[PDB]
Design a protein around this ligand. Structure first.
Ligand code: ANP
Ligand code: ANP
Ligand code: MG
Ligand code: MG
Ligand code: MG
Ligand code: MG
Lengths: 305, 319
């Protein structure tokens, strides 16, 4: 409890440069940047709430970007960063290198930004948390933040399609992974780690599409399932509309994306016979997992020790 | 700045309650909420990074939502908050009110969620790192909405800037279509073919009527806003306001105020209105003006045929 008092008595002497983060170690984003899934994944993997937006050279910091700004962003839209910065237009908080931490804190208290640029040769950036970690004499962290300013230290966003059999937007795959890991116990984390689930979803020929042709509208090729015909594979619609004819009387209803079928085919029921038929009414794009594949994924999860 | 040097002596004895936020004034979110546009707008207007998540009563805080967990959420998808809160499953730091701020700061600096719920356990409130720091330094810190520093101080700063009327982001809200069962379609089809003469086989063969009913936008829905009542957009028919479209209520309730004296009655399904609007005879031309006002009392699903469409259907005369 003496470290806090020490730091308090020493704040009038220490300047921003004593706790400054060199410009070489700053996490920046160019203003001429688009918020496609890859850029947003790179933004989030750093776990930095406030990121400076620079135009041209890195020393030219022109705006700010808050992770809280990425709420209504759809990575599918691939919106440009300029539109977001214009809608929000965060205020720049400037400071000089020859400043005392007392004045720094006085500014941050009512300041429009807890992140400030230290300069007009820009050297780096200082945040309220730096000042307070220096005062308290003990470092801080919300574990989302990567490391504690000493070059020493979660799911990597590696859900990107790079020219494979079928094309789906990374945001779609992410929603798939989330929905399966959450609302289906067969793919729950407790039974199968998320990394293994992701490997399984992007496994070749698992995710597949299907084109609709009025000619063969009721052909056996467009039937993902047939009543009282055994199968061994689990389906999860990603895009499209399907007609489910269920029950012994054959009640017909419609189902769109994120409607899964035949979970028991994967786990032990032994045999799985669905009392329903799933026909395609449009272009379908879905996941198809075989019992063998699910068992292999479980083998993977139990093999890592 | 001398307060900082004694803030330590205070942190060794103070308790969370001295600087705690009261569970009564905490902005929370229901456990079963959906992260649609409206809910996301609430969340982002409140301007709070961490939001407790309770199931049922406010005292049963079970989860914790981070705003960072919304980066890859689409308000258009209407993603349930349950999936996110169960997928990220951020841990909760439960604490007792008799917790010296020393151990509190020790726990916070460790990495556990900065927001800790202080508590047949009873809920006491919320404790944040910035709260302990504002108590130590005895100063005000603010980048979220409210200026309250330690306890009981409602205030306004910069004209409540965080609430920015986000409606510009919204999607068009254009329903892809209206789903009517095949059986409801057949029932409506037959009812119009029989009772109403305009749609009778004498003037429209079955095929042309089916095409007109399957035509785009003829079948429509109308959501009921219990608060925004009597809106001029919810009046299918206005009294003595020329109209040119025939209606047929398939599902829902409507209040019909008819007669100059204005008697109001309640009509439900298969109660159609303004059939003469379809007639196109020479005469602001050959106007039809109804003597009634039809407004909605519940969600409506109906047909709505313009005079155009009907006369086109009649123009489809092929022997
Ligand atoms: N954009 C950034 N790039 C690099 N380092 C940063 C950045 N922002 C803050 N830091 C450093 O990260 C450490 C902790 O700062 P901090 O203010 O906690 O970041 P943060 O947690 O992301 N913001 P907050 O959400 O308020 O906690 C300090 O050493 C800062 O200098
Ligand atoms: N869910 C909540 N509802 C109402 N008030 C809250 C809530 N969470 C925190 N507060 C209060 O809001 C103040 C701001 O907390 P704060 O630690 O700044 O959150 P935060 O800024 O989003 N996290 P950070 O980015 O590190 O600053 C605190 O003093 C709390 O008293
Ligand atoms: Mg931090
Ligand atoms: Mg989308
Ligand atoms: Mg804050
Ligand atoms: Mg959108």
């Amino acid at each position: 409890e003496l470290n806090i008092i020490q730091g308090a008595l020493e704040l009038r002497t220490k300047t921003v440069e004593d706790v400054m983060t060199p410009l070489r170690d700053c996490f920046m984003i160019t203003g001429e940047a688009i918020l496609d899934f890859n850029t947003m994944s790179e933004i989030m993997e750093s776990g930095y709430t406030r990121i400076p937006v620079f135009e041209g050279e890195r020393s030219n910091i022109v705006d700010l970007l808050f992770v809280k700004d990425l709420a209504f962003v759809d990575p599918d839209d691939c919106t440009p960063l300029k539109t977001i910065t214009k809608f929000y237009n965060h205020p720049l908080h400037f400071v000089f290198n020859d400043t005392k931490l007392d004045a720094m804190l006085e500014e941050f208290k009512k300041g429009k930004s807890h992140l400030a640029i230290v300069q007009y040769e820009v050297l780096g950036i200082v945040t309220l948390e730096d000042v307070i970690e220096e005062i308290i004499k003990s470092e801080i962290l919300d574990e989302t933040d990567l490391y504690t300013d000493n070059r020493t230290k979660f799911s990597a966003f590696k859900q990107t399609d790079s020219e494979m059999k079928v094309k789906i937007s990374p945001q779609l795959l992410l929603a798939m992974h989330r929905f399966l890991a959450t609302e289906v116990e067969a793919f729950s984390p407790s039974q199968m780690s998320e990394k293994i689930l992701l490997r399984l979803l992007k496994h070749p020929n698992v995710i597949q599409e299907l084109k609709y042709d009025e000619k063969n509208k009721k052909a056996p090729e467009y039937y993902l399932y047939q009543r009282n015909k055994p199968v061994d594979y689990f389906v999860l619609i990603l895009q499209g509309k399907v007609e489910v004819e269920a029950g012994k009387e054959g009640m017909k209803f419609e189902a769109s994306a994120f409607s899964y079928y035949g979970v028991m085919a994967l786990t032990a029921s032994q045999v799985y016979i669905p009392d329903y038929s799933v026909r395609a009414l449009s272009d379908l794009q879905f996941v198809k997992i075989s019992r063998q594949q699910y068992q292999n994924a479980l083998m993977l999860e139990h093999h890592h020790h």
